[PDB]
Subunit: 121 residues, 2 copies
C-alpha cells in the first residue's frame, strides 16, 4: 500500500543510475516497503514519472519520494516537484498521495563516510 | 602536515556550498586533520585551486582531496582531476585523490530516515 521511490539526478555516464540501483537493492533487503522503485531526472530510464506510475500500478496508495541528492538545488525545489505535480508547471489518482521527502544534507553519517574515504576505506 | 580538502559540485543556489561548509565544520570537530578546506568546482568560491593553495600555504605536504559527490561522473573522472593536475589538459607536495560517497550502507540508513521524515 506504500512505496519508496528513490530519485536521482541521472547522468550520461552510467554511474549515477548504477548507484540508485544498488541503493534500491539494499533498501529491498531491509524489508521495509512492499514496493521500491528508482527514477532518474535526466538522461536515463526509468524516468521519475515512470517510477511513480510503476509504484501506482503495483497498488501503492502512499508514494514516498526521496531525492537521493546531497543538497537542495533547483532540481529538488523546482524540477522534481514539477514532475511530481506538487507545484505549478503524470496523472496521480485521487486515492494516491505523494509524500516528498528531504535530501541527504550534512548528516553526521556523511561525515563518517567522508572520513573513511579520506583514508581510502 | 596533512590537509583534508572537500570538493563539491557548486551551484547557483547557496545550498551546495552551505553543505560543504557544514561538513568541514563537523570534520574539524573530530580533530583528525591539522588543515581542513572546501572548494567548489563551479559557480562559487573558494574554488578547488584556491582550496588546495590555501592548504599548501598553511603547511600541508599531503593533501587528501575527497569528492563530496554521490557517484562518479565526468566531474570526478575528468574535471576535478584536471584542476588537480592529475591528468593532461604544486610542489613536492602530494595530492591524494579519494573516491566519492557511493552506495554506502550508511547512505541507505540516511535514506530510510528521510523516507520517514527523520
Ligand atoms: Ni544539474
Ligand atoms: Ni554538473
Amino acid at each position: 500500500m506504500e512505496a519508496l521511490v528513490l530519485v536521482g539526478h541521472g547522468t550520461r555516464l552510467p554511474y549515477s543510475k548504477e548507484l540508485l540501483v544498488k541503493l534500491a537493492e539494499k533498501v529491498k533487503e531491509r524489508n521495509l516497503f512492499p514496493i521500491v522503485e528508482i527514477g532518474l531526472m535526466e538522461f536515463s530510464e526509468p524516468t521519475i514519472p515512470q517510477a511513480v506510475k510503476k509504484a501506482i500500478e503495483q497498488g501503492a496508495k502512499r508514494i514516498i519520494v526521496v531525492p537521493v541528492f546531497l543538497a537542495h538545488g533547483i532540481h529538488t525545489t523546482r524540477d522534481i516537484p514539477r514532475l511530481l505535480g506538487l507545484i505549478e508547471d503524470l496523472e496521480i489518482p485521487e486515492d494516491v498521495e505523494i509524500i516528498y521527502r528531504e535530501p541527504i544534507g550534512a548528516d553526521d553519517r556523511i561525515v563518517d563516510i567522508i572520513i573513511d574515504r579520506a583514508f581510502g576505506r
